[PDB]
Amino acid sequence: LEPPPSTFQPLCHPLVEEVSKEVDGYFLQHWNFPNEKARKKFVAAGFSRVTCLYFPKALDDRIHFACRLLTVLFLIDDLLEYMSFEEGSAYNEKLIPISRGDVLPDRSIPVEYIIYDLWESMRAHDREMADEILEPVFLFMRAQTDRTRARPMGLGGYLEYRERDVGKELLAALMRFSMGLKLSPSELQRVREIDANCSKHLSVVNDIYSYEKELYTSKTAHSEGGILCTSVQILAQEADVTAEAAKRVLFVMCREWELRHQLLVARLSAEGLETPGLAAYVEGLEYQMSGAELWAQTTLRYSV
Amino acid sequence: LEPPPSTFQPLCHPLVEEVSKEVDGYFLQHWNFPNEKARKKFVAAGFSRVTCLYFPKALDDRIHFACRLLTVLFLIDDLLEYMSFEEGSAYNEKLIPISRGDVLPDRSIPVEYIIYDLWESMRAHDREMADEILEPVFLFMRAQTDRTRARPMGLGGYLEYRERDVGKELLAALMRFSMGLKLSPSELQRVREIDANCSKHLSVVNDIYSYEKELYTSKTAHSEGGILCTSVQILAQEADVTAEAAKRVLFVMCREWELRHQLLVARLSAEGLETPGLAAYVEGLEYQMSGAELWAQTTLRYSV
Ligand SMILES: C=C(C)[C@H]1CC[N@@H+]2CCC[C@H](C)[C@@]2(C)C1
Ligand SMILES: C=C(C)[C@H]1CC[N@@H+]2CCC[C@H](C)[C@@]2(C)C1
Ligand SMILES: [Mg+2]
Ligand SMILES: [Mg+2]
Ligand SMILES: [Mg+2]
Ligand SMILES: [Mg+2]
Ligand SMILES: [Mg+2]
Ligand SMILES: [Mg+2]
C-alpha cells in the first residue's frame, strides 16, 4: 500500500527514548497481561512513540502524562472489544468518578488505581488545564460503546460519530495541556472548522491502517464490542469495491483534507484572527495528523 | 483537471463522419430548435460522435439508428431542465406509447413523430432486438423525473438510482442491437455483476466532466428539472470538501472500477464461462466506458 504525497513533515518529541522506557516499564510493572506474548506485543505497539509523534512540541516535564493517558486509553480500547455494550459502558463508567478524583480506587485492580494516580499527578502539575481534559475524555469513553456502532451508517453520519470515538477533543485538550497552550473561549470557537476537518483525517487514516486488525477482531471477539465500524467498510459497500480499493480512494481524500487544512489556516490569517496562541495550535493539529500517519505505517499493532 | 491513467483505449466507429452529417442533418431539419445559436450548439455537442465512440464496433447499417435514439434522448434531457418534475413526467409519458407503436404521433409535434418513426424503422430492421430496448428506455425516462432526485442520498443510494438515470440498461440493449449481438438470458445473467460495475464508471465519469454545466443549470433553469443531482455534489457534502476536491477523489474511484472490470472479466474467462458472444459484449462495455470519457473530456457541451 503506497501513500500519496503529503506536504506535512512529522515531528517527534526529543525525549521519546527516555519517556518511552519510563512509561513502558511502569505498565509492565502494574498492568495485567495474560502472558509474556501480550507483554511483548505491548512494547511493540510503541504507545509512547505515537504520543511523542502527536505532541512533538510538548513541554519536557509534561510529555510523560500524555504517554500515560494515551497508553491506558489504548489498553482499554482493546479490552472493550471482548465485552458487550452494556459490559463496556459499565467498565468505562466506573473509571469516570475515579478520574475526577472523587471516588478512591480499588487498589487491587490495576486499571482503577493507574487512572486515579495519573489524574492526581496531572491536577498536581497544572490543575486548570488538567481539568479541561476530563469531559473530552468521558465524551470519547461514552462514544466507544454508543449503540450507533450497530446501526448502519453512511460516510457523513460515520464521520460525525467518529469525531467522538476517535477522541478529537480529548487529543486537543491533552495537546494544549502538554504544551501549556492557553486559549480563550473566543479563540477556541474561532477554529471549530479546522478541528472538524482535522478529525476526519485522524479517523480515516486510522481506519485505513487498522482495517485488517479490525476485520479479524470482528470475526473473533465479541459480536457487539468487536463490531466492524470503519470508513473503509462503508465506502467499500457503497462503491462496491474491495477494502483495498476503498483504502486507496480514502487516502486521496485524506490528502484533500490536508489541503483544506492549509486553506482554512491561510484564510484565518487573512484576518487578524490568527492570534499567536492560535498559530501554535493549528501547527499542533498538523503534527497530530502527520504523526498518527507515520506511526500507523510502522507500528506492529496494525501489521498483525 | 488532471485524469489519472487508464488502461482502456477508446475506439471510434469508422463511418462517424457520414452518420454524423446524416443524423445531425435530420434533426436540423425536423427538431424545433429555438434559434440559430442553439442549432450551432447542437452541432458542437457532437451527439453522433459520442454514439460512434460508445459503439465503435456497431454494424455499418445500424450505427445511424443508435445516433438517432441517443440524439433525441440528449435533446429531451436538456428539455426537462426547464420543467417541473410533473411537467417532465407528463412529457416523457406521452412518448412511451408512441415508442411502442400503440399510439399514432401528432405529426405537427416533432418530438412525437421523430420518436414514432425512429422505433418503427428500428422494428423494421430487427424486430425482436428493437423490442428489447423499449423497457430499458422507459425505465431511464421515468428515472429522470423521479422525486428521489430532490431527496437526500448517500453515495451508494445515488449510484443505485443513477444506474437508471444514466441509462446503462438501454445502452446495453442498444449496443447489442447495433452489433447484432444476440445473447441468451443465462449469458446476460452471467455478466450482471460486470454490468453494475460498468454503470458506476459511466455515471461518475459523466458527473465529473459535466459538473460545471450542471452547476450553472441548477442555478438558472427550473429548480426541480434542473436540480443538482450528482456524485460530485454528494461526495463533497459527506466529506466536507470542495467540488474540485471531490472530482479528484471520484476519478481515482473510477480507475478502481476499471480494475474491477478487468478482474471480473478475467474471473469469467477462468471458468469456462466467457462465451464468444459474452466476449464481444464485455469488450463492448469497455468501449462505452473509455469512449464516454474521451467525448466527455473534449465536447463543447461540457466545456462551454
Ligand atoms: C488519534 C487516533 C488515530 C486514535 C487512534 C486510536 N486511539 C484509541 C485509544 C485512544 C485514542 C484517542 C485513539 C482513539 C487515538
Ligand atoms: C452514458 C452516459 C454517461 C450518458 C451521457 C448522457 N446521456 C444523456 C442522454 C441519454 C443518454 C443515455 C445519456 C444519459 C448517456
Ligand atoms: Mg476504538
Ligand atoms: Mg479499536
Ligand atoms: Mg481503528
Ligand atoms: Mg440527465
Ligand atoms: Mg443532463
Ligand atoms: Mg451529467
CB-CB contact of A233 with A154 (8 Å): no
Distant-in-sequence, close-in-space partners of B244: CB < 8 Å, separation ≥ 6? none
CA distance B186 to B175: 18
Topology classification of domain B1-304 = Farnesyl Diphosphate Synthase (1.10.600)
Tell me which H or E stretch contains B208. helix B192-209
Length of chain A: 304
Q: Is B302 helix (H, G, I), strand (E, B) or coil?
A: helix
Nearest to B239 by CA among A148, A257, A264: A257
Nearest to B291 by CA among B171, B139, B192: B171
CB-CB contact of B145 with B92 (8 Å): yes
Rg (CA), chain A: 19
Grid coordinates representing B124 are 423494421
Task: Name the CA dihedral angle for A135, A140, A144, A146, rounded to a multiple of 10 degrees.
Answer: 70
Residue with cell 459527506: B238
A54 is catalytic: yes
Residue numbers in A near B240 (CB within 8 A) = 196-197, 200, 260
Amino acid at B243: A
What is the DSSP code (8-state) at residue B180? T
Q: Label residue A256 exposed, middle or buried (CB < 10 Å: 0-12, 13-18, 19+).
A: buried
Stated in angstroms to one decimal place, the resolution of this structure is: 2.5
CA distance B136 to B141: 9
Q: Given its phi and psi angles, is residue B189 left (phi above 0), alpha (psi -120 to 50 degrees) or beta?
A: alpha
Best A194, A256, A260 member to test B by mutation, with max B CBs in 10 Å, is A256
Q: How far is CA A80 from CA A29, A224, B144, in A?
A: 22, 10, 48
* CA B166 to ligand 2: nearest atom: 14
- What would the DSSP string read from start to end of A57-112? T--TTTHHHHHHHHHHHHHHHHHGGGS-HHHHHHHHHHHHHHHHT-S---TTSHHH
- How many other C-beta atoms can be found within 10 angstroms of the C-beta atom of residue B122? 23
Tell me which H or E stretch contains A246. helix A243-269
CA distance B45 to B43: 5
Any atom of ligand 1 within 6 Å of the Cβ of A23: no
User: Closest approach of chain B CAs to the CA of A298, in angstroms?
Assistant: 25
Beta strands in chain B (DSSP E): none
Amino acid at A247: K
State whether A249 and B245 contact (CB < 8 Å): no
CA distance A179 to A182: 9
Distance from chain centroid for Cα B167:
5
Distant-in-sequence, close-in-space partners of A112: CB < 8 Å, separation ≥ 6? A94, A95, A98, A105, A106
- How many other C-beta atoms can be found within 10 angstroms of the C-beta atom of residue A298? 15
Grid coordinates representing A36 are 509474556
State whether B252 and A252 contact (CB < 8 Å): yes
CA distance B263 to A80: 38
Length of chain B: 304
Residue ranges per structural domain of chain B: 1-304
CB-CB contact of A155 with A234 (8 Å): yes
CB-CB contact of B119 with B66 (8 Å): no
CA distance B11 to B244: 29
Q: How far is CA A5 from CA A253, A265, A282, B232, B249, in A?
A: 12, 20, 21, 23, 14
Helical residues (DSSP H) of A166-242, grouped into ranges: 168-179, 185-190, 192-220, 231-239
Grid coordinates representing B28 are 436540423
Experimental method: X-ray
Distance from chain centroid for Cα A15:
20
Q: How far is CA A231 from CA A153, A200, A223, A243, in A?
A: 9, 10, 19, 10
CB-CB contact of B62 with B106 (8 Å): no
CA distance B213 to A141: 47
CA distance A299 to A296: 6
Cα atoms in the 13 Å half-sphere on the side-chain side of A172 = 25
Distant-in-sequence, close-in-space partners of A36: CB < 8 Å, separation ≥ 6? none
Answer yes or no: is B206 a known binding residue.
yes
CB-CB contact of B296 with B12 (8 Å): no
Task: Name the CA dihedral angle for A185, A187, A191, A192, rounded to a multiple of 10 degrees.
Answer: 10
Task: Name the CA dihedral angle for B221, B226, B230, B236, rounded to a multiple of 10 degrees.
Answer: 50
Rg (CA), chain B: 19
Amino acid at B161: Y
Q: Label residue B243 exposed, middle or buried (CB < 10 Å: 0-12, 13-18, 19+).
A: middle
Any atom of ligand 2 within 6 Å of the Cβ of B81: no
CA distance B277 to B272: 13
CA distance A211 to A46: 19
Grid coordinates representing B38 are 442553439
Query: End-to-end distance of chain B based on CA atoms, in angstroms?
Result: 15
Q: Is B7 helix (H, G, I), strand (E, B) or coil?
A: coil
Q: How far is CA A61 from CA A15, A19, B55, in A?
A: 10, 10, 70
Best A163, A200, A252 member to test B by mutation, with max B CBs in 10 Å, is A252
- How many other C-beta atoms can be found within 10 angstroms of the C-beta atom of residue B197? 23
CA distance A274 to A280: 10
Q: How far is CA B42 from CA B75, B82, B218, in A?
A: 9, 17, 20
CA triple B30-B31-B37, angle to 5 deg? 120
CB-CB contact of A54 with A171 (8 Å): yes
DSSP 3-state helix, strand, coil percentages of chain A (rounded to 5)? 75, 0, 25
Torsion sign over Cα A141, A246, B269, B183: positive
Query: End-to-end distance of chain A based on CA atoms, in angstroms?
Result: 15
- How many other C-beta atoms can be found within 10 angstroms of the C-beta atom of residue A126? 16
Q: How far is CA B278 from CA A270, A295, B57, B252, B281, in A?
A: 59, 48, 14, 28, 5
| Ligand showing the shortest atom-to-Cα distance for residue A199 | 1
